[PDB]
Amino acid sequence: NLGTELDYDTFCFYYDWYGSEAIDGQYRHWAHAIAPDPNGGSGQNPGTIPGTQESIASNFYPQLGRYSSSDPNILTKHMDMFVMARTGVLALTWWNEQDETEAKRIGLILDAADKKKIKVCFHLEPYPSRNVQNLRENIVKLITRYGNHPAFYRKDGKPLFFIYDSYLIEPSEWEKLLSPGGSITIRNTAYDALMIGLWTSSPTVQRPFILNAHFDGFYTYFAATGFTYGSTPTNWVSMQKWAKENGKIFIPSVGPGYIDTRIRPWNGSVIRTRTDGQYYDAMYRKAIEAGVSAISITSFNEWHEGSQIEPAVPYTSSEFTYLDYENREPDYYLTRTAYWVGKFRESKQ
Numbered sequence: 001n002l003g004t005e006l007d008y009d010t011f012c013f014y015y016d017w018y019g020s021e022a023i024d025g026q027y028r029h030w031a032h033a034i035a036p037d038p039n040g041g042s043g044q045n046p047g048t049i050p051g052t053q054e055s056i057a058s059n060f061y062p063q064l065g066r067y068s069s070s071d072p073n074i075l076t077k078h079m080d081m082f083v084m085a086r087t088g089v090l091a092l093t094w095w096n097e098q099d100e101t102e103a104k105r106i107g108l109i110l111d112a113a114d115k116k117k118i119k120v121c122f123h124l125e126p127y128p129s130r131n132v133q134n135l136r137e138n139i140v141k142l143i144t145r146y147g148n149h150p151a152f153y154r155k156d157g158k159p160l161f162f163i164y165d166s167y168l169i170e171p172s173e174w175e176k177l178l179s180p181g182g183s184i185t186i187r188n189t190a191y192d193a194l195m196i197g198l199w200t201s202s203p204t205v206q207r208p209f210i211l212n213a214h215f216d217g218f219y220t221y222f223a224a225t226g227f228t229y230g231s232t233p234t235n236w237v238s239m240q241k242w243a244k245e246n247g248k249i250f251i252p253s254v255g256p257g258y259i260d261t262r263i264r265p266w267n268g269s270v271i272r273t274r275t276d277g278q279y280y281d282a283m284y285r286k287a288i289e290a291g292v293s294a295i296s297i298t299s300f301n302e303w304h305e306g307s308q309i310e311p312a313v314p315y316t317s318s319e320f321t322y323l324d325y326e327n328r329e330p331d332y333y334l335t336r337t338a339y340w341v342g343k344f345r346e347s348k349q
């Protein structure tokens with residue numbers, strides 16, 4: 001009873017898409033295309049961030065440098081960071097790449113996590129032609145491949161998946177997978193799971209979406225307060241009340257800030273300043289005050305979006321002056337996460 005143990009109702013969104021020339025053949029994701037402005041003109045040639053030491057696809061700069069997500073030595077360090085943050089579940093981005101390098105990295109992440117008693121669940125991304133049939137097939141494959149790994153997460157006996165942009169699939173399709181009577185149900189099968197859909201907009205839209213889709217619960221993802229109704233923390237008390245009334249698990253997402261203008265220069269209105277941790281504190285406090293059972297953290301390491309809690313260092317290169325943790329040390333967001341996990345646990349019975 002030391003106040004240092006991992007919390008297994010705390011999910012931290014993790015991205016495994018970073019590469020180095022030496023391990024991966026290219027400094028993958030550190031190099032990244034710049035997105036055209038969706039409200040902008042034709043003939044934009046926005047260019048690319050080259051992923052050199054000097055110019056990476058983030059407004060911040062990793063303490064660990066331009067690392068590979070396939071480097072077992074980096075993974076070790078990441079797991080130690082999870083232990084410092086007390087975040088017991090790594091919620092792994094999953095893009096259905098169907099390639100050996102994906103398969104290798106997932107096994108490495110599971111192995112490294114297990115050494116530290118961290119668990120892994122999957123965050124099912126909007127891969128091409130995603131639909132409920134190939135989602136079922138992929139859930140079966142992930143549970144078959146990884147379900148007996150000691151680090152594979154279960155909650156009261158069930159795997160858990162987060163489904164990003166779940167609204168891209170109609171509730172009538174979801175029902176087929178997620179109702180106990182659905183044509184291709186997972187309920188009561190070896191492949192049953194807690195399925196957590198993304199609550200985006202107003203209750204008039206989201207309440208029937210979640211019920212009609214038969215999701216087990218919902219999360220909000222966005223680290224930027226006010227980006228959606230669901231990512232506006234003053235709505236969380238009423239979202240939790242509805243969840244409780246309807247037998248759903250609400251897993252609000254909290255984050256330390258947001259800034260993605262290296263890769264999305266037109267998206268400055270979504271910037272949320274970190275204010276030496278005060279933003280993170282405010283958001284985490286709202287989640288805990290809402291009385292939820294589980295919390296998700298956006299993010300461990302979405303460096304493109306500036307939501308990371310992973311350590312960052314000051315850096316000024318000839319090409320860019322990076323943001324940094326300012327008056328706080330590089331590991332502040334890890335140790336502040338541990339503080340909040342303790343407050344969250346204090347709140348759970």
Ligand SMILES: OC[C@H]1O[C@H](O[C@H]2[C@@H](O)[C@H](O)[C@@H](CO)O[C@@H]2O)[C@@H](O)[C@@H](O)[C@@H]1O
Pocket residue numbers: 165200227228260264267305
């Ligand atoms: O436009 C940048 C934005 O893209 C993605 O968010 C989009 C979509 O995935 C979300 O569901 C809706 C919610 O209203 O917003 C966008 O259309 C995300 O990658 C997001 O992190 C990013 O900022």
Ligand SMILES: OC[C@H]1CN[C@@H](O)[C@@H](O[C@H]2O[C@H](CO)[C@@H](O)[C@H](O)[C@@H]2O)[C@@H]1O
Pocket residue numbers: 093123125126164302304305
């Ligand atoms: O994990 C959910 C969602 C969070 N925001 C992004 O990470 C998004 O991925 C898309 O944007 C990133 C850049 O931010 C890009 O590298 C990816 O290929 C996706 O286009 C995630 O889906």
